Amino acid sequence: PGRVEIDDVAPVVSCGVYPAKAVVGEVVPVSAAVWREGHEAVAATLVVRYLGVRYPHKPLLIPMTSGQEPFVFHGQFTPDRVGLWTFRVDGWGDPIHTWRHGLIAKLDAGELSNDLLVGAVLLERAATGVPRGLRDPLLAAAAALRTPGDPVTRTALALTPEIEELLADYPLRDLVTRGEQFGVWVDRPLARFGAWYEMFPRSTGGWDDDGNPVHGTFATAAAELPRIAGMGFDVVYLPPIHPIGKVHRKGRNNSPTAAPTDVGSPWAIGSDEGGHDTVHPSLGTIDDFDDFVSAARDLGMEVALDLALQCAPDHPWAREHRQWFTELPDGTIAYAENPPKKYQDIYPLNFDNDPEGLYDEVLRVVQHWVNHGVKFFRVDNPHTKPPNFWAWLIAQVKTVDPDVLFLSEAFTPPARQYGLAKLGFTQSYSYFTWRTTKWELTEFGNQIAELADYRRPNLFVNTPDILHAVLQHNGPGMFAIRAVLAATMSPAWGMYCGYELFEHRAVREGSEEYLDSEKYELRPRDFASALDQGRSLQPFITRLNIIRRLHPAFQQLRTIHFHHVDNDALLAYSKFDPATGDCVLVVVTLNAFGPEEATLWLDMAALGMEDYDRFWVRDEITGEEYQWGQANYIRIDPARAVAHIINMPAVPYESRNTLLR
Amino acid sequence: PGRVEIDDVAPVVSCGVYPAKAVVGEVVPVSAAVWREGHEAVAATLVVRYLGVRYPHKPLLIPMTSGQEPFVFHGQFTPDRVGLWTFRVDGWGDPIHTWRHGLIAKLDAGELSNDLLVGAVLLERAATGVPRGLRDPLLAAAAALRTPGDPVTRTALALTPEIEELLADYPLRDLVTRGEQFGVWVDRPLARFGAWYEMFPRSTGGWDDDGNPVHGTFATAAAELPRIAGMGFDVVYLPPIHPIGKVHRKGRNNSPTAAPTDVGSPWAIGSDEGGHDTVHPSLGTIDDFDDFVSAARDLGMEVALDLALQCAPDHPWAREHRQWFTELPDGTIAYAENPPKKYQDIYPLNFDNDPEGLYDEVLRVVQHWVNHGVKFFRVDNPHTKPPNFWAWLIAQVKTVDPDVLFLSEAFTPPARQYGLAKLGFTQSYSYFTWRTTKWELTEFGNQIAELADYRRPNLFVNTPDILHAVLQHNGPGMFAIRAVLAATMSPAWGMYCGYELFEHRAVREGSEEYLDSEKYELRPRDFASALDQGRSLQPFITRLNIIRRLHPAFQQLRTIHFHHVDNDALLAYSKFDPATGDCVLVVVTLNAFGPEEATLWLDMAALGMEDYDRFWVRDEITGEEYQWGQANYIRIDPARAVAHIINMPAVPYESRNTLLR
Ligand SMILES: OC[C@H]1O[C@H](O[C@H]2[C@H](O)[C@@H](O)[C@@H](O)O[C@@H]2CO)[C@H](O)[C@@H](O)[C@@H]1O
Ligand SMILES: OC[C@H]1O[C@H](O[C@H]2[C@H](O)[C@@H](O)[C@@H](O)O[C@@H]2CO)[C@H](O)[C@@H](O)[C@@H]1O
């Protein structure tokens, strides 16, 4: 006990402490190592069971197949309902296979008088497992050489294509041993595949007769939702919609002192007007929000709200519940700090003084919005709050409603960043922005999965906080380039408003902060004119999102594969879908300014073709079709197209094993 | 629950199912990831406990240090007694460090008055934890930071190295969190470091007046033990000493039919004379064995017996207990087979018919020899017997006597080979023989550990069954080369008798079987003449083992590191000892025939030196000394020396950190 060894099971996360991640309709590949004594054959069955919903802290049997690696068995299952699933690998020794294969070897050299009876004692014993109806042809197979005679006489009834297939249906299993049980938590598909748009509701004001921005409202914001849907975004992410503190409120450009009219950063949550459960009054009544949400839902979109666990001084909690802060000896509370950033306008919470006190309130707050149709939260700076809290908050929320999803904006070293994902965060921001070399992007891409069992990255081209240097000086071409990279590399990607307008001016050289940042200032934008003057990337983005919807390969984490292109400025990779066999290849240039050309060397095995093969491809932007082979010429001219997104011949029905591991 | 995150702990094997491996006086490096909220400091303590001498199914505290990888903490402990040890990592937040480090920054920019009081309640509260009269210079500091004044005035004793070292012995810990507990099974040092010599007792006969071999006896064999000890071997491994079956006994050169005088293979255990518990009568009474063991013991050596769970037909078990076999329909028992090898002289056992029946008998047998001083067994073909048996047998034996060690001769694909090691085998044979190119050996060497936490390889230059082709035609030079490789790469190595005589003739071209194999035939050898005629590698081997004893670096699994040599035929690697700092470099040629030269590029960081450094080395065979630097000229002439074994400057007391991971 264990009679048959089962080891190195995957996917298991942190040795089973945390469930693995998957979504509905995703092919989940499972593998394990099973072995036993000698050359005696062994087989494994992947046992999948679907439990209820519920959240952590009749069976379905799938046969597994051996492969290249000795003793390593592979399997798959596709979850069809949201919730918690279980799998384990059962190992057994299948005597029939041993006997059959051994006899065929002996059959070639023509006596054997012994083995045949042994077979003959197998199939009837096998017969006990099969129902009297179809039970019978084995006994037919079982009684055609117990009667003496030639060897080839009854090999008929053994090598018959009819009895492996029934035995496949009902197998004769010996020494059955069960492996450990591990769990997968399946979420709705939006957890993996969807595109994000970050907009500031207040910036939808649109100026007055004097050229001065006007504070917008949920009503006006909702007016902008169609153009957004038009670009193909599935989720709209809103900076906090709560009242902005009036004390120590910051002025334009992170200025310490606020003018009387300045608006302050939405992240300075709380004022005498309200807390985390109240809409900032300038935006509108809470019904207005309900109306905005409903508007989005009409267009096929979802709303994601910023969850920032911090307080401005006027926040009711500063008075009503003050245990929740770390108060200095002179009674003041130290302003929030994240090195080297300073947040003079807010207070960090203290989760240790009154844990079940604060815990319950924050749960209360999150639940408020769940009741208003918000089932995706962009958790803000999760790494500066206790891990166990998040683990608690997530499980606590998801158990009442399991369709609630969390995105963790944790720009922090790996152990924390990936660590946080493990606790349950459905998606995580990534280090993506700071990957810009062919080698960096290659590595960033491959790691994507790799870590798929527990991290889903959301690739944002920019955020209000991050205006990468490369975007600053390379002109509109680069904006395309990052967009192509983001959209193709990950199932989930995002964009901060104005990106499509090529906003590229930073506050000072060497900074990553947007000049005249929207956080501190109202920023109406006039998208329409840009469209008219052909200085908008809105069309391109639309075409990018359409492509994603069109090809299911782009909803996959696991299958990215990089092909060699002998140019340091050109990067070429491919994705495929295990289900439909869909297959797509992307080639992009990382230099926005000069045409760059090269020879692209496909790894045909990876694409499901032999090396010598020749095949036809289609360019999804152009529609042009051409014939390609293992080595192909490619030349990319920015200012014509910064990328070729190529539809490739569908991966044959060997899809499932090109997914192995 | 889980306030401070502790994850990715190592060493853990198969997620804790199996204990890790270590020996007495071995430095075991432990690492884990610990993190918490924000920039609040965190610390970890490695907690070691020594339990018993019992075997698987007051605390010692070691502080752990951060390092290169954020949030990753490293530690080490050195077991001083045989038995089962436990370790876990405890994580805590140390507020003092947060406070101190923050203050130094503030101290430079010169009121700030708030923080000082905060410190004051820390050291006081810190002091309460040290309720000893050695406390507290802290109130000296604790009442040296409260009264009004300048900051540097009241920094008094805080920055000065007087209260941290005190805090070091007694620390102020917050949010202490317990990590999971994992176990290490510590064995006697021979488990890792010792050299093996394989000899056939029967071959010590020495001819008669006609030039005909004479069967030897334990008495005569014991006569050869000094010479063996003289070469520096710590263990003598004996093919089975039991009676050889008389039916289907195999003849010289594996011929199927045995002449009346032929001896047969010792692995055909059992005859009407006796079973596994009896000495083959031709060797002598069991007292003779006891005498042989004692002879070895006198010379500093150990005896290891072959444990082969198989039977010849005349074996008493064939009648007395026949449930133990797989009996055919016609009542015969199929002869043992291991593809493609055929073992016509033996019967495989059947472990499923009467498990606790057979289990108990084999335990009985193993136990017999343990009582006769044999505490190392060379388990034979373990992969052809059930895993659970071995797991049981090992745990069952070791619990009565924990100094009993097992070596698994499992030449099988990885999942099995390493799997077998994991469930308890103290050492394992390896694929070593078939690694012969610079890149193959490099990969093989690095893997050694890697897998050290659960596999200890025993590197055999040859075995009675394996006479590698490379030895067949490259002449005495190669025998040196493999010996250098085996002896240096692994703490444990071995050689089969006659290797030192350059026995290089195989039965047919393309085979790995020794011509006129000792298994089937008596082979007395005359070592003395070879010594006299200078055609023996006995001197070299002696010098190799002395070197191993001399430098503790060579008893390490973990520390091998490969340095670049720009010649495909030259391989250069180094080992060091974390304890003493000993450091050694080996450079060998893989080409036995032509002089080969190159530039050797040391990774000085790995050797504990800066790149620009210049240092002195000594050649352990030659005694010559010279000055070297980062890049050095090296030229190797076989037929002079196939290797340079170089003593290098001792790794500084940064030994612990170059062992990290
Ligand atoms: O008002 C508080 C804080 O707001 C902004 O910082 C935000 C940041 O923009 C968000 O992306 C979030 O992830 O982090 C901070 C809030 O947690 C301003 O940049 C900052 O100056 C201000 O103090
Ligand atoms: O006597 C049975 C069998 O003995 C030998 O095979 C051995 C082998 O030499 C040992 O090294 C061991 O590891 O495996 C076998 C026993 O399990 C002969 O090689 C073989 O011909 C003979 O049948």
Author numbering:
A (entry chain A), B (entry chain B): 15 to 71, 92 to 144, 149 to 699
Paper text:
GlgE is an α-maltose-1-phosphate:(1 → 4)-α-D-glucan-4-α-D-maltosyltransferase that catalyzes the addition of maltose to maltooligosaccharides. One such example is GlgE, which has been genetically validated as an anti-tubercular target. Deletion of the glgE gene in M. tb results in the rapid killing of the bacterium due to the toxic effects of M1P accumulation.
Superimposing the homodimers of the Sco GlgEI and Mtb GlgE-MAL using the Cα atoms results in an R.M.S. displacement value of 2.5 Å. Domain A, Domain N, and Domain S form the very extended dimer interface between GlgE subunits. As previously stated, one additional minor difference between the Sco and Mtb GlgE orthologs is that the Mtb GlgE crystal structures possess an intermolecular disulfide bridge between residue C29 of the two molecules in the GlgE dimer. The C29 residue is not conserved in the majority of the deposited GlgE protein sequences and GlgE orthologs form a stable homodimer when lacking a disulfide bond. Despite the absence of the phosphate in the phosphate binding site of the GlgE-MAL, the residues responsible for this coordination exhibit only minor positional shifts when compared to the maltose-bound structure.
